[model samples]
Target: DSFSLLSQITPHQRCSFYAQVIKTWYSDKNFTLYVTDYTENELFFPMSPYTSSSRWRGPFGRFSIRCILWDEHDFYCRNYIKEGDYVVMKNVRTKIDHLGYLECILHGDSAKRYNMSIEKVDSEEPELNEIKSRKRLYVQN
Candidate 1:
């Protein structure tokens, strides 16, 4: 089941939603994805590439949400996902990360295990329009 919008999700909750993968990185076997639903969460980590002088090409400000994936989830993302893909993540746990910003962790589930997932989807899907629209506006900014 899809959970709330990225802006609506709070720490200490399990949330699932659709987002556009903006960037991906690896830390040993762990994987991290910077994604955006085009909705801004006030509590998300501020990632403004404009002022920071970084190479991040994703949306500036609080629009980006960082998700950390472990084990099987990390494996799948590293092998199959890439920047600018549309994905629907399942059963992601939210928490306050080290920098006091909101972040998500996916490590599968308890029952039956491997219940957490992220799968690529077509950009034409209606579920992706909201993000696509906001992304259009970002191009002009």
Candidate 2:
């Protein structure tokens, strides 16, 4: 199957794709990740490196997507992923959060049923190279 682009994913869709891990943090009983393919999605949370005080590590604005993981997925993400690494996220569920922003969730059961998985990928991968090219544009302007 073809990979879904972050900009093309919609609420209720099951999508998979390659993206760079911009950041990751623990959230109560869950884990959260900020990732990007350097493409902007209107429904994503708004952020701007130019205006925000936090040191942004990826493309600014709505280019990043939030992913919350629980259970097994949580275990894997916390132990294996890190910021600035390329990742392949498979069979993730997309949705609109309480704040009306778009986000993704990876629950344990669904992940097992759908064969969902997340893994670090090499920077030399073609998909990651594409992200690097787009990031270059974001960096320039």
Candidate 3:
């Protein structure tokens, strides 16, 4: 994934993604990788048969965020969040990893509990205008 965008969403700031579920795990906690376009303003959907850690089988989109959540949120993610789902995560607390990659922390508050909004494709996202039409989105299950 591209490291260029890491700088834009750092230091516990906010960043959102119109991304596809790349991978997920469950253990002591919940963790996932959501892939988006290289530039913040492009779109990418995964095409099929593109499963596994190897991203090359998918589109050329160059960015992914490592998302973490625990407890009930972890349960929600495991049951509701499936691989290949197109999602929109808002108010994600972004940071940098030890390897210098981007990391995302999920928060959901009754008032503002880190909004991890997952929407259907038909739903209109005005902010999606930022997504460049020329870019291709890749996804797979």
The candidate that achieves the highest TM-score relative to the unseen native structure: 2
Local error of candidate 2 at 114, Å?
A: 1.4
Name the best candidate (by lDDT): 2
What is the model-wide C-alpha lDDT for candidate 2?
A: 0.86
Q: Candidate 3: lDDT over CA atoms?
A: 0.51
Displacement of the residue 28 alpha carbon in candidate 3, Å: 3.1
Residues 1-141 of candidate 1: C-alpha lDDT, one tens digit per residue: 766789899998888899999888888969999999888899987876657546676877898888998877887778778888899988788899877899989875546453677899898999888888888887875
Model 3: per-residue lDDT, tens digit, 1-141? 122233255555676656555566667656455554434321223233445456432244334456776555566776667665556666667666676555677754445455544333322555444433323332321
How many residue pairs collide in each prediction?
0, 0, 14
For all predicted structures, in order, the TM-scores are 0.88, 0.91, 0.58
Candidate ranking (TM-score, best to worst): 2, 1, 3
* Candidates' C-alpha lDDT: 0.84, 0.86, 0.51
Candidate 3 scores a C-alpha RMSD against the true structure in Å of: 7.2
- Over 37-114, each residue of candidate 2 has an lDDT whose tens digit, in order, gives 988899988887668657567776788999999998898778678888899989888889889999988888843678
Q: Return the TM-score for candidate 2, rounded to 2 decimals.
A: 0.91
